[PDB]
Design a protein around this nucleic acid. Sequence first.
RNA 1: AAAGAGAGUUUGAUCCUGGCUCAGGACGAACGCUGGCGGCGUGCCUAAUACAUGCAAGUCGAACGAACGGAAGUUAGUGGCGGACGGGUGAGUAACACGUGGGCAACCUGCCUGUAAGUUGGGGAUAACUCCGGGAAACCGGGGCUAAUACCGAAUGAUAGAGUGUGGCGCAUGCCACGCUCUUGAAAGAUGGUUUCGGCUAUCGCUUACAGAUGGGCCCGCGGUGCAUUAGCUAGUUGGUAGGGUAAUGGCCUACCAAGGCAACGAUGCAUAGCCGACCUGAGAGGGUGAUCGGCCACACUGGGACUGAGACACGGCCCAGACUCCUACGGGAGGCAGCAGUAGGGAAUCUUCCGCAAUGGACGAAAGUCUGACGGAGCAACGC
RNA 2: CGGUAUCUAACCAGAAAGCCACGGCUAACUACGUGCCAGCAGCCGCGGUAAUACGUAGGUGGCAAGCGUUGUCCGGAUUUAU
RNA 3: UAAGGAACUCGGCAAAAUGACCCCGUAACUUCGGGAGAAGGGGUGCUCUAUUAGGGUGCAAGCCCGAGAGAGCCGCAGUGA
Lengths: 88, 82, 122, 80
Amino acid sequence: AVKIRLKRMGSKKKPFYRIVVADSRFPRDGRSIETIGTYNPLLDPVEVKIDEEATLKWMHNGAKPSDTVRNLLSREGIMEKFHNQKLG
Amino acid sequence: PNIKSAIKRVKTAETRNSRNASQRSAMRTAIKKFDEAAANNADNAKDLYVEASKKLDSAVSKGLIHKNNAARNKSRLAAKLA
Amino acid sequence: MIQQESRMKVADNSGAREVLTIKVLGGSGRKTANIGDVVVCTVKQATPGGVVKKGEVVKAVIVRTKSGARRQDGSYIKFDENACVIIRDDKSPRGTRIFGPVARELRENNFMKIVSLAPEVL
Amino acid sequence: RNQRKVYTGRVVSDKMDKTITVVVETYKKHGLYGKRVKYSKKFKAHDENNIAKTGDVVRISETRPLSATKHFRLLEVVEE
RNA sequence: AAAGAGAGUUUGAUCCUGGCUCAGGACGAACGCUGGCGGCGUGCCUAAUACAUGCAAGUCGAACGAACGGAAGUUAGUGGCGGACGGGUGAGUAACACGUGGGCAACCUGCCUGUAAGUUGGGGAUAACUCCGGGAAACCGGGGCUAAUACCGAAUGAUAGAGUGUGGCGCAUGCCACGCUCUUGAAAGAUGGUUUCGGCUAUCGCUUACAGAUGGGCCCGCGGUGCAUUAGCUAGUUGGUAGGGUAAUGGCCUACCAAGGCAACGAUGCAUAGCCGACCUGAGAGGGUGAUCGGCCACACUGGGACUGAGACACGGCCCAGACUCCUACGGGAGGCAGCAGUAGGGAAUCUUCCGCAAUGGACGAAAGUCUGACGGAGCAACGC
RNA sequence: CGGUAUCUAACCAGAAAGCCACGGCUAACUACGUGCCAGCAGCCGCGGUAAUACGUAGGUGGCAAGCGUUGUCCGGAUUUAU
RNA sequence: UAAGGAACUCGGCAAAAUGACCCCGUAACUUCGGGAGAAGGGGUGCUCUAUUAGGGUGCAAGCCCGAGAGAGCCGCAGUGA
Ligand SMILES: [Mg+2]
Ligand SMILES: [Mg+2]
Ligand SMILES: [Mg+2]
Ligand SMILES: [Mg+2]
Ligand SMILES: [Mg+2]
Ligand SMILES: [Mg+2]
Ligand SMILES: [Mg+2]
Ligand SMILES: [Mg+2]
Ligand SMILES: [Mg+2]
Ligand SMILES: [Mg+2]
Ligand SMILES: [Mg+2]
Ligand SMILES: [Mg+2]
Ligand SMILES: [Mg+2]
Ligand SMILES: [Mg+2]
Ligand SMILES: [Mg+2]
Ligand SMILES: [Mg+2]
Ligand SMILES: [Mg+2]
Ligand SMILES: [Mg+2]
Ligand SMILES: [Mg+2]
Ligand SMILES: [Mg+2]
Ligand SMILES: [Mg+2]
Ligand SMILES: [Mg+2]
Ligand SMILES: [Mg+2]
Ligand SMILES: [Mg+2]
Ligand SMILES: [Mg+2]
Ligand SMILES: [Mg+2]
Ligand SMILES: [Mg+2]
Ligand SMILES: [Mg+2]
Ligand SMILES: [Mg+2]
Ligand SMILES: [Mg+2]
Ligand SMILES: [Mg+2]
Ligand SMILES: [Mg+2]
Ligand SMILES: [Mg+2]
Ligand SMILES: [Mg+2]
Ligand SMILES: [Mg+2]
Ligand SMILES: [Mg+2]
Ligand SMILES: [Mg+2]
Ligand SMILES: [Mg+2]
Ligand SMILES: [Mg+2]
Ligand SMILES: [Mg+2]
Ligand SMILES: [Mg+2]
Ligand SMILES: [Mg+2]
Ligand SMILES: [Mg+2]
Ligand SMILES: [Mg+2]
Ligand SMILES: [Mg+2]
Ligand SMILES: [Mg+2]
Ligand SMILES: [Mg+2]
Ligand SMILES: [Mg+2]
Ligand SMILES: [Mg+2]
Ligand SMILES: [Mg+2]
Ligand SMILES: [Mg+2]
Ligand SMILES: [Mg+2]
Ligand SMILES: [Mg+2]
Ligand SMILES: [Mg+2]
Ligand SMILES: [Mg+2]
Ligand SMILES: [Mg+2]
Ligand SMILES: [Mg+2]
Ligand SMILES: [Mg+2]
Ligand SMILES: [Mg+2]
Ligand SMILES: [Mg+2]
Ligand SMILES: [Mg+2]
Ligand SMILES: [Mg+2]
Ligand SMILES: [Mg+2]
Ligand SMILES: [Mg+2]
Ligand SMILES: [Mg+2]
Ligand SMILES: [Mg+2]
Ligand SMILES: [Mg+2]
Ligand SMILES: [Mg+2]
Ligand SMILES: [Mg+2]
Ligand SMILES: [Mg+2]
Ligand SMILES: [Mg+2]
Ligand SMILES: [Mg+2]
Ligand SMILES: [Mg+2]
Ligand SMILES: [Mg+2]
Ligand SMILES: [Mg+2]
């Protein structure tokens, strides 16, 4: 089951996450299908950059955001679009 | 075994082995008594194709044979019917 | 019934494979040894890389024979080949494992370690 | 429709049934000096009706494996 | 754009040819003398040698029969899913193993997403439990009783099979769409709202079919090593005909028929070696390497085999054989650190038997939640920047 | 992780410098001891009672929490030369 | 003739052992012919398919020759002396 999740990279006690699409089976920092965006939690206003087009393409093919990703996509505001394109 | 979840697997697989071997050899007997009937051109050759067909695709629903395997064998037996 | 020039297989873990008997200990004109009897012998065939080499003079104990022993209760035992175990100055074997069945008569001769190591004491 | 690969060579042997041996000649420059060199490796093609004869110039197309070694089929007989 | 340094040494003295040596850079390095700190990384290259002792794979009572509680509320076994992922090692392998580019009209795919049909009616058991019997122990038999989303028939339902009609087609074998006749193939309930109780209904499920996505299987062109003081190699070998088997083509296997196939453009044999992205050096072209990080492969004490499953011929699963260690009441039994630490040995040479699931990602669950030596951190060593 | 990183308040020049070379290649030289001995060395080669080459001092030169030696690879090597 | 198997003896003298047909395979050395039946192994009986597949003979009737296979059956043993 392919799902979108964070990927930890950076230095010791300085994490930086890169939103990727990959299977659950593959390692956390291993194979991935493609990359969507990044996520910096250290910045006090957390800044995130997303494709907003590859995500919606993937979520109509059987992709599920994880716990932290869903908060990111909701705050950015594309799960509304996933709502509207589903029923419309 | 020495992981508690592994002791169950070794003994629950034997129960599946027992049930599978029993009805897998039931399938082969129906085929065994068809091709010999086809050679003799008896009247039983026609209706021995039906339960052999019934045995083959019942095994698919039971899940111990692939649907391509069942579909293939039925076609090849039908040729021998003459 | 094993006398001089008799040639018997060795049934332990030392380097030897086959043995020819030189002398039957235990008397002046003695001419035969049987199960449980120590015999002086020489190595005619050895496995490569073993402890005991070819052409070496050693003593050993007979452990099973084609003409076995009779018991006080009137019963007999007979094997299919003549086998041997190479021992030290005392009654301790020079190998670490023993192959095949072993006659019970070795216990009464106080060959306790060999009986302990044997896979079957018949 | 995706298209398979087609080659062109010269028949060498027809002593086998239903098949021919075709040598394909090709160029390839040397790795370090840079001089073009002949390179020929022969294939196996399926002769449906033994049409092709020794020495002919033919065209062969790629297919699924027809046998242990054959995975090409004869297409045209350009020259005899 | 970039763009290349020489020196010493044969002679009584010289100019050429020519070898040897030196000045530079880099290590997973070691040794010698010395030694303050912080940040970021690295640390068995040898014996794929043998392994004490702890922990690394479980979860679900919202699928089915118990103990505390005056019978409210929380905790073993059957059953489902997961253990094929994550983690380790480089032995073997000179070949479609890998890199790069294609083909599959010759293939499969649990969980995930969408859509369409339904989820109707029965039967016989068996664990647990309770007695008896055997053995030192591992553990094995016999009698009786019970349930389930456990198991087995039944009604209805195929683009599954056979026989056809049409069209539109393609790359030879052949493909796509629709229609007709005949024969086979399915299922499970649980937790709640309403009503009345009939019944309806929400959620998670269950069966069949088709799409997408994902992960794999097979075939092919080209590319990357030493020896000719290694010249022939092969017989299921090479092709064909019929059948068997597989998810799928194929000598993959079998019977028959013929004698073919490969090689001086280096077959065969011996020796060595996991492959690549990349790393070091170099003006460049090249030369040497493949530790750490990422992708693929092979292996799991040494050989062989298969079962269960969507997926294995399976690191902490099973059976047989072998070597080794251990427990035996002599009848028989139990094991596998190339998982994280740690021990002995080898070596010139390499670390703690530590703290947590708080973050990320995994398995189970409807969810809190449980498991996670993955992973986050900490400890030792001027090993490097 | 962890009262960790990070601030501000005060006292102390106080606890904190070694390693290798100095004939040429190659930056850096004088005394004393020894007398083909002890010894040095990558090459040329130094030592046989005035040694800038052996051993120790003073001084100097390269680096510095380092500095030297050994092993392996590329360069210089146009010394396999497309 | 049990167990042993040259311990006998000047010396394996004498005796024992191998022995037919078909198939596989075969070394040093060589004067290139050999060595060579080197060595070392495997199969043999009877019944059915079977007047076989196919050959010799004849104008036909018929007669003679007889490989491969499959399935079986019986003994301690199938060139059973
Ligand atoms: Mg914040
Ligand atoms: Mg049915
Ligand atoms: Mg001179
Ligand atoms: Mg020169
Ligand atoms: Mg340089
Ligand atoms: Mg240097
Ligand atoms: Mg210190
Ligand atoms: Mg120190
Ligand atoms: Mg290692
Ligand atoms: Mg090993
Ligand atoms: Mg243990
Ligand atoms: Mg734990
Ligand atoms: Mg309950
Ligand atoms: Mg549930
Ligand atoms: Mg329980
Ligand atoms: Mg793995
Ligand atoms: Mg390897
Ligand atoms: Mg590796
Ligand atoms: Mg590829
Ligand atoms: Mg019942
Ligand atoms: Mg019972
Ligand atoms: Mg019962
Ligand atoms: Mg139906
Ligand atoms: Mg039905
Ligand atoms: Mg389903
Ligand atoms: Mg994979
Ligand atoms: Mg294939
Ligand atoms: Mg190749
Ligand atoms: Mg075929
Ligand atoms: Mg083959
Ligand atoms: Mg080769
Ligand atoms: Mg250069
Ligand atoms: Mg380069
Ligand atoms: Mg390592
Ligand atoms: Mg080991
Ligand atoms: Mg299966
Ligand atoms: Mg295995
Ligand atoms: Mg496993
Ligand atoms: Mg494997
Ligand atoms: Mg694994
Ligand atoms: Mg283990
Ligand atoms: Mg064992
Ligand atoms: Mg370890
Ligand atoms: Mg050690
Ligand atoms: Mg040591
Ligand atoms: Mg966690
Ligand atoms: Mg989590
Ligand atoms: Mg779920
Ligand atoms: Mg645990
Ligand atoms: Mg822990
Ligand atoms: Mg870690
Ligand atoms: Mg440090
Ligand atoms: Mg040091
Ligand atoms: Mg404080
Ligand atoms: Mg401050
Ligand atoms: Mg002050
Ligand atoms: Mg100078
Ligand atoms: Mg002086
Ligand atoms: Mg000097
Ligand atoms: Mg000096
Ligand atoms: Mg000084
Ligand atoms: Mg100084
Ligand atoms: Mg520094
Ligand atoms: Mg250094
Ligand atoms: Mg060096
Ligand atoms: Mg060069
Ligand atoms: Mg006799
Ligand atoms: Mg006898
Ligand atoms: Mg003999
Ligand atoms: Mg003799
Ligand atoms: Mg005598
Ligand atoms: Mg004499
Ligand atoms: Mg004679
Ligand atoms: Mg005939
Ligand atoms: Mg005879």
